[PDB]
Amino acid sequence: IPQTLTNTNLFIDGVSFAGDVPSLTLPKLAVKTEQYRAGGMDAPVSIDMGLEAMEAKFSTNGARREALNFFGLADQSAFNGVFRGSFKGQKGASVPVVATLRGLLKEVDPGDWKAGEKAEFKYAVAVSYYKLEVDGREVYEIDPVNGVRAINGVDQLAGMRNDLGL
Amino acid sequence: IPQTLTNTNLFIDGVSFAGDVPSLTLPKLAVKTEQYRAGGMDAPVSIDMGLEAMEAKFSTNGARREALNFFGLADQSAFNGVFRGSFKGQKGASVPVVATLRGLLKEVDPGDWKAGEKAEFKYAVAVSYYKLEVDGREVYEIDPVNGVRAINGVDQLAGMRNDLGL
Amino acid sequence: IPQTLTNTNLFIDGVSFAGDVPSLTLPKLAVKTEQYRAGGMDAPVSIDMGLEAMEAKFSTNGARREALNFFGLADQSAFNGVFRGSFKGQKGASVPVVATLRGLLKEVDPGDWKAGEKAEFKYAVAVSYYKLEVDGREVYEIDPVNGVRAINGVDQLAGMRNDLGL
Amino acid sequence: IPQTLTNTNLFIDGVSFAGDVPSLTLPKLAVKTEQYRAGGMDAPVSIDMGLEAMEAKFSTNGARREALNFFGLADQSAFNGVFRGSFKGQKGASVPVVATLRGLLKEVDPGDWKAGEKAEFKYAVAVSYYKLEVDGREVYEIDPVNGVRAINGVDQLAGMRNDLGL
Amino acid sequence: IPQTLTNTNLFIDGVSFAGDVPSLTLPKLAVKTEQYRAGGMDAPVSIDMGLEAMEAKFSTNGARREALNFFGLADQSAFNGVFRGSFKGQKGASVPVVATLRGLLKEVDPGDWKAGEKAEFKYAVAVSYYKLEVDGREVYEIDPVNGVRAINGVDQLAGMRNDLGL
Amino acid sequence: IPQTLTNTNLFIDGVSFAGDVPSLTLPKLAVKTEQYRAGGMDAPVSIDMGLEAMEAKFSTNGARREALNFFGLADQSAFNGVFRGSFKGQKGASVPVVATLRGLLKEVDPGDWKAGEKAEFKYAVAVSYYKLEVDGREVYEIDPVNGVRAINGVDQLAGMRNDLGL
Amino acid sequence: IPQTLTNTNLFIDGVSFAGDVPSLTLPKLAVKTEQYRAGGMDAPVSIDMGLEAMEAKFSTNGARREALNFFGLADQSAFNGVFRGSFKGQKGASVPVVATLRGLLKEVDPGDWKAGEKAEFKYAVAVSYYKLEVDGREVYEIDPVNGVRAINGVDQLAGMRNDLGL
Amino acid sequence: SFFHGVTVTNVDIGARTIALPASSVIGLCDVFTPGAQASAKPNVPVLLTSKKDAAAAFGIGSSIYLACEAIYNRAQAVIVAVGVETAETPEAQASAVIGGISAAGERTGLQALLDGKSRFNAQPRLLVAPGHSAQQAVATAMDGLAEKLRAIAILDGPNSTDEAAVAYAKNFGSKRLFMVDPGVQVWDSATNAARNAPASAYAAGLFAWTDAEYGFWSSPSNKEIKGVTGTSRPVEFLDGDETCRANLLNNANIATIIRDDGYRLWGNRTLSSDSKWAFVTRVRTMDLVMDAILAGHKWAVDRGITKTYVKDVTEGLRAFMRDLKNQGAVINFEVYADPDLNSASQLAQGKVYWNIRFTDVPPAENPNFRVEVTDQWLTEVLDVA
Amino acid sequence: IRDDGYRLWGNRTLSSDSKWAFVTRVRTMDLVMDAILAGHKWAVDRGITKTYVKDVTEGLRAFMRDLKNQGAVINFEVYADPDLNSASQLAQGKVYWNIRFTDVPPAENPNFRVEVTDQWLTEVLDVA
Amino acid sequence: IRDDGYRLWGNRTLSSDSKWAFVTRVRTMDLVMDAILAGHKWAVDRGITKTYVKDVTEGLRAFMRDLKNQGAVINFEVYADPDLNSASQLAQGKVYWNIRFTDVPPAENPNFRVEVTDQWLTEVLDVA
Secondary structure, three states: OOOOEEEEEEEOOOOEOOOOOOOOOOOOOOEOOOOOOOOOOOOOOOOOOOEOOOEOOOOOOOOOOOOHHHOOOOOOOOOOOEEEEEEOOOOOOOEEEEEEOOEEOOEEOOOOEOOOOOOOOOEOOEEOOEEEEEOOOEEEEEOOOOOOOEOOOOEOOHHHHHHHOO | OOOOEEEEEEEOOOOEOOOOOOOEOOOOEEEOOOOOOOOOOOOOOOOOOOEOOOEOOOOOOOOOOOOHHHOOOOOOOOOOOEEEEEEOOOOOOOEEEEEEOOEEOOEEOOOOEOOOOOOOOOEOOEEOOEEEEEOOOEEEEEOOOOOOOEOOOOEOOHHHHHHHOO | OOOOEEEEEEEOOOOEOOOOOOOOOOOOOOEOOOOOOOOOOOOOOOOOOOEOOOEOOOOOOOOOOOOHHHOOOOOOOOOOOEEEEEEOOOOOOOEEEEEEOOEEOOEEOOOOEOOOOOOOOOEOOEEOOEEEEEOOOEEEEEOOOOOOOEOOOOEOOHHHHHHHOO | OOOOEEEEEEEOOOOEOOOOOOOEOOOOEEEOOOOOOOOOOOOOOOOOOOEOOOEOOOOOOOOOOOOHHHOOOOOOOOOOOEEEEEEOOOOOOOEEEEEEOOEEOOEEOOOOEOOOOOOOOOEOOEEOOEEEEEOOOEEEEEOOOOOOOEOOOOEOOHHHHHHHOO | OOOOEEEEEEEOOOOEOOOOOOOEOOOOEEEOOOOOOOOOOOOOOOOOOOEOOOEOOOOOOOOOOOOHHHOOOOOOOOOOOEEEEEEOOOOOOOEEEEEEOOEEOOOEOOOOOOOOOOOOOOEOOEEOOEEEEEOOOEEEEEOOOOOOOEOOOOEOOHHHHHHHOO | OOOOEEEEEEEOOOOEOOOOOOOEOOOOEEEOOOOOOOOOOOOOOOOOOOEOOOEOOOOOOOOOOOOHHHOOOOOOOOOOOEEEEEEOOOOOOOEEEEEEOOEEOOEEOOOOEOOOOOOOOOEOOEEOOEEEEEOOOEEEEEOOOOOOOEOOOOEOOHHHHHHHOO | OOOOEEEEEEEOOOOEOOOOOOOEOOOOEEEOOOOOOOOOOOOOOOOOOOEOOOEOOOOOOOOOOOOHHHOOOOOOOOOOOEEEEEEOOOOOOOEEEEEEOOEEOOOEOOOOOOOOOOOOOOEOOEEOOEEEEEOOOEEEEEOOOOOOOEOOOOEOOHHHHHHHOO | OOOOOOOEEEOOOOOOOOOEEOOOOEEEEEEEOOOOOOOOOOOOOEEEOOHHHHHHHOOOOOHHHHHHHHHHOOEEOOEEEEEEEOOOOHHHHHHHHHOEOOOOOOOEHHHHHHHHHHHOOOOOOEEEOOOOOOOHHHHHHHHHHHHOOOOEEEEOOOOOOOHHHHHHHOOOOOOOOEEEOOOEOOEEOOOOEEOOOOOHHHHHHHHHHHHHOOOOOOOOOOOEOOOOOOEOOOOOOOOOOOOOHHHHHOOOOOEEEEOOOOOEEEOOEOOOOOHHHOEHHHHHHHHHHHHHHHOOOHHHOOOEOOOOHHHHHHHHHHHHHHHHHHOOOEEEEOOEOOOOOOOHHHHHOOOEEEEOOEEEOOOOOOOOOOOOOOOOOOOOOOOOO | OOOOOOOOOOOEOOOOOHHHOEHHHHHHHHHHHHHHHOOOHHHOOOOOOOOHHHHHHHHHHHHHHHHHHOOOEEEEOOEOOOOOOOHHHHHOOOOOOEOOEEEOOEOOOEEEEOOEEOOOOOOOOOOO | OOOOOOOOOOOEOOOOOHHHOEHHHHHHHHHHHHHHHOOOHHHOOOOOOOOHHHHHHHHHHHHHHHHHHOOOEEEEOOEOOOOOOOHHHHHOOOOOOEOOEEEOOOOOOOOEEEOOOOOOOOOOOOOO
């Protein structure tokens, strides 16, 4: 049932970037693993050790102001932004995929201005909070400063929250 | 609202390089982060630890003199220069983006002279001071030897300036 | 049955340090031994001579106040604190490991402040009392000023308590 | 609530070293302990026996004069100096941590001058007096020649001061 | 005012290589920098620490003898050579760029002889002395064993020459 | 105001070693302290007890003769030598730091001659007399056999000179 | 005037080891000092008390016989040997440095034979007599059993020879 | 003149009181006498940051100044004072303190406190009227105002007896009203004798300090009223239910002041007919949580409604709300945009709705230490062993 | 309102007619047309051709569309009102068009409904 | 003052105008400009280009900033006064800028207020 991504749009603070954003990138949600090899067994196995540093990145190719004006902002996690993306599907009805991500803008990379090529600024928000929804349905909600890694409702850290006494 | 960069020009000391400068590069403004993982939470979060070493680079492909004659100049931060860049925009009115950057010229790299190819010198100013403006409006002003990282007016180090007693 | 430690949290006086505590360290419970070699035998054997000086240590990397404000406190063993640590386990259900340790804060070591690195304070409570529990089950309870070295209930000094007449 | 240290500054006699001081080090406040094992108990316990020799150390990497000109100064405890350090915190508002320390400069170590490396002088003030404040609030005040070890106001030697008759 | 490089010629010891030299390469003049981050400031700044190892390289694709016969020559800095290069300029009058460089031949790399491809020897003089002129005007003169880094006349080491007492 | 050390030169008897001296080392000026803990006070304090054995060390990596020919010389304190070092400073004007040190050559250590590595001799003058100047201004003058420890003019032993009757 | 060591060769009894000797080591000529602190002065000064035990060491990585066959030889100081070493110098003319050293072989250390690594024997002659020459010119001649410590001709023990009546 | 040197000035300055700076502002309404020095036109809300400003603004020997000192002694907070010129009769005094619109110029009396915001951004979170509070009239005014404000109004009932206090408390039941009965008795150094204060000033001051070094969501129940000595009536407090005077007043929804020489406050409970709002912690949380929300969603109160407006706000809420959870303020929460209300009609008319259901930290109260003196561990020791 | 004359407060305007209650409504309806006229200047003269009606109805759809793109409005609809465009009116120069569109409703009166419950109570505290 | 002509005494200067009461004020205001001119020597000739105004307003912000770094002043503000810069003035070479800044107030008249009390009396002596 071919889905595929058709169109994409990017918000920062309500301000639509319907225009300059030729690339988005959601934070690669990865676990920490640590290949556990130990007594009684050959071949490791790997363990949930917590997630990796979620970093997201978009790249407007216009001097956009509304994006540049969050860089190094004293209040880390002030930059909010929402990465919407419509997946078409061969049978018409498009699936809205939307990923709000309150984080810290971190860095800004304007590449080689060449007087004949889309300048293309770049950005890389060090994501703090991150909720990825599909068809208006929570699939992920990863909150580090709180411990709320919750796959579609069920909170996989509800058991460690107690043992830590949070 | 497609913007994109159209034309580019580069100043060093008032002397326009309207001619040889097929590439400019503004300093990639990046923070230092340090992925903070700590008690009570899985998944890091990242912290404003100050910026990275801002280095800017242009690359005239002519033996230009006015550029070469700043290399290794005893007085680091004597090289001034202004990196102007006009963003067109589909609706005509172009947005002037201009980035003055008092810094130290640092290094000069003339590549492979081949008797049939633009020689292309290269340069890489270790930027000290750096003010990036958009549409005649301060967006950045990063001054290390003073601590003046000021996103469009508001100075994000105004709070650490006091605690340090500067 | 891979267990391993996932997340960690540290209490001092109820105040959760859900935040700054990148390292905990429970007191290395060691006996005093004294390698007993004697008549009738080659090769020593080693004897329970009582425990070693239990010292525990955590290390918040923030100027935390709630921790610093126990140093050298006249009333040795006023510092309480609880070192909780959740062990994941490949089969989900996490094992709460928690180690209350009423002791004397002893020393505080702020390392090299470098203007670009987590300062990392350090602490080293000279543990007086110490109860280590696993899955809400007493595994250790070592109390020197009383003589109550009790592996999960059974008190191994119940026999010396009588001979001393305590 | 991630804090961490961002920037640092160092005073000697009002003269700001806003410049050369890539490392500070506050005096490791440690007690003397003496692992007390004694009758009626196995396992020691440790006693407040007074503090250890507080020594602080900074290390300007410039021939700074204002620092060098306190070495071996006849009047021990003439060197004053204040070690300020701003802790950022993820939520913006930085916590000023400042540690005045009237002491004796003691020693000065210029390392290997290598004609291609920051020379880096070194210093190690044998601290006499020492007041560490956090957010403009006294956390420590250790004064040996007077006996005034006072955790945030309350003086833990107020009881021994009387018994000694000082 | 488009300049660009048109033709190139290479001398070794007066002997013109008007023929085999499809590539020249002047020594990339770079400073040593060392990103100086220190007290009172976030963001480094970078310092003149002296230059980098100037190495120049040409690559005749003929068994030329006059070049090969300097390799590993006991008297380092016997190899002289002058790298001339004519920059055209759209307005006719060509700018002579010429870079004498007394140095040590260092290494020689004959690549893959393939019986159907320009063999192309290679060379890499470890440059000792180096004077780059533009339009018959000294732009650089870098002499390490003497300390004579002189941008067009003015000697930027005239101040350190005195302090060293040379 | 970044200073840092750029270049270095070393004299022995007027003969400049402009060449072989990849490392200098000024004598670590340290006091003797002796952590004074005593009646009426917890926490020591430390006392000026006189300086430590000033030893300086350079390390030419050439068989230099002019240096080797002072070893074990009957007349201790015949070896003179001056350790000059130019500190650049970001604002150009370099600060001459120069440290004359009449002493006894003491020892000479030629390390592992490896037929493919700078042999690197080593030296370690047991410094008798020692005057360290900055910007042509006496900062230190330590003379043991005379008692003349004089921080920039003022002689801190002028008071003990009288009591000893020297 | 860069010198540096290029090649090295090692003799034992005329037999050249032009082959196996990847490391030589001349005896670290050190005096005995004894930091003299005494009445009328703070800060020690250090005295010529005679030299230290000169031990030299080479390390052929072949089962060489000609070297092994001097170990523990009844006649201490039968092992002779000459440690030659050619210092190149940037200006061609190499400086012969040669160090004859009649001594006692003392010890031999064959390290870890690993079936895939240069075995590397080791040696450590307890040097009795030792004459180090540079450019065919005596720089040192240290003879203990005779008292002939003579820096380039002049004998620094000529004065103690008389007082002892030798 | 301008003296050039270093003036050694001998002057009596009696001991820095010291006070941790707070944030929660205090709407003070008391009496005073407008003299030559007390520069403060009677019905004009002035702002105060320290005792020096209090003095220069009000006669050092004024009831206003006394309350100001009673607050500062605990915490250096921002006060909005209103100098009700001393009237004669109790009726005239009460009426003059309650105020109203009266003088077409401005809102007099307690109503002047509504000028606190827009004047100095000092919107009173804690209303207080020292003494002028026994009067049922002033208290009713305090309650109404307190509602039109969302501010805990701190009353002080009839200082004399307990029967009067209880009878007085039964007249109320208004959520915001939080009463403190025992009139504090502090040793005035000036007259060198035990003064008699109305208690409300000290309660409000400590309220501010509790908001700071503990949290606005932590009760001031067990916190130490700085300054002061005994009360005007020794308050009993023991364990075992009983007729413990404290237990009595804290079952008529009144806070008392217990332990040696006015050690501390006592009573998280508040005057409320509704049991849900029994705890001041509940009310204060429910109020200040929203203060933080609005001071943050300022941008949300205008602006062309876009497709993403609803989401911008429901997420912005989940940000502030989440942060409060992190720092203890609440325990879980739930924000969304109530669908059965959000319509085309309401949106065309600007309006729009959301839900913010959450739980507040229950203040631990009444720990029940059950204890049995047995003879179980008897043989375990003593006998032989 | 707000500290020391912080800001303005009130999008409403003096109007007996509820439709024009918002200044946003009035200002939009006015300045939209300013942009239209300053752009259709060419349209106010010129020999009426067969394609005159279309040149204008498209020119309108250009400016109007652009305004939609940059937020100014939310959808619109332009056409050349037929029941009016006649030979008589055209001979006398005149001609008509409709420009019905919708304006951005300024968000006002956010109703934060809040309930302090005790639902998430057991979820924390007790045991856990 | 002080023993045998120890030292000077008086930062004040003869001035009817209170603003220029301190020699520190006058000397700063003078030598600041000496440093500016000895540095903007290049700026006093040269064909006015489009970027002339900016070259100078930045060059000023360089010297000015450096002075701030080394204590000389405390903040500053440089720009090119618009209400004066005109085509006429520029054709006649002239051009204007503002350089408003603040100067270091010399600490003078420290007022050591002191009270010999009897507060810390019981804290010592009696019993203890």
